[PDB]
């Protein structure tokens, strides 16, 4: 059964916990939404109507000890548009979790570093938004809403 209608293109997808080493976006979980025309194609959100949208995403990175000094974690929301068919970054962040260190004599030092991105944009019909990370081997989608990604038509 259903209740009050509600509208606007909406999306809040959560990572698949059962995906091992990859970022699969899901909507068929408790506090996730995907309605009113928003399509999730090849792990990509397709805008159903032209207007102003709010884009957000969080990624949580965890590693058990620091192997490399030159470890860089990235997270970007990209857009390939119908008018300009090249994927361009709308929101981006870079984070270095390890300042040298490289534990020689130690007992593993688990690090946690989250990254959050958000912005308002004008999108056109058929544009594909994509949230991507460079190292999907450090994703920590364990307990809950630690990794997510969504748009909402404002």
């Amino acid at each position: 059964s259903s209740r009050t209608p509600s509208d606007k293109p909406v999306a809040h997808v959560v990572a698949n916990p059962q995906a091992e080493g990859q970022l699969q976006w899901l909507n068929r979980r408790a506090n996730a939404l995907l309605a009113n025309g928003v399509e999730l194609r090849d792990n990509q959100l397709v805008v159903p109507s032209e207007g102003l949208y709010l884009i957000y995403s969080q990624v949580l990175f965890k590693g058990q000890g620091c192997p490399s000094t030159h470890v860089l974690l990235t997270h970007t929301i990209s857009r390939i548009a119908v008018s300009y068919q090249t994927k361009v970054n709308l929101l981006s962040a870079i984070k270095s979790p390890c300042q040298r260190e490289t534990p020689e004599g130690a007992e593993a030092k688990p690090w946690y570093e989250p990254i959050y991105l958000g912005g308002v944009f004008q999108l056109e019909k058929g544009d594909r938004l994509s949230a991507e990370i460079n190292r999907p081997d450090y994703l920590d989608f364990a307990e809950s809403g630690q990794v997510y990604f969504g748009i909402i038509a404002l």
Partner: protein, 112 residues
């Protein structure tokens, strides 16, 4: 069991909006080739609902689930709605269906 239409019996009020969700259980069927058919109570003809305007379709290929939210409900939108999808593997090609009924009750227009 090969497409699972979830809201089997729905009863909404005139002027509202019902969503029907269908989940693909055959991993060879495509969420790109989805079809919708409604059959109005008492008549024998399956008409194909077109994707646009009042009939909004939400698809997620990741979980292979698609839905059909219908707005502006009238009393002429009472019937059996089914979803469909086109499957294709090797040398095999087939299609799949579901099932779910809608009844819309009138508003009665209060007279002073």
């Amino acid at each position: 069991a090969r497409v699972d239409q979830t809201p089997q019996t729905i009863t909404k009020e005139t002027g509202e909006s019902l969503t029907i969700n269908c989940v693909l259980r055959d991993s060879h069927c495509a969420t790109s080739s989805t079809y919708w058919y409604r059959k109005k109570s008492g008549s024998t003809n399956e008409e194909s609902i077109s994707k646009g305007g009042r009939y909004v379709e939400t698809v997620n290929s990741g979980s292979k689930s698609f839905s059909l939210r219908i707005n502006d409900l009238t009393v002429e939108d009472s019937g059996t709605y089914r979803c469909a999808s086109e499957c294709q593997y090797g040398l095999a090609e087939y299609d799949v269906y579901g099932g779910g009924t809608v009844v819309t009750v009138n508003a009665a227009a209060h007279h002073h």
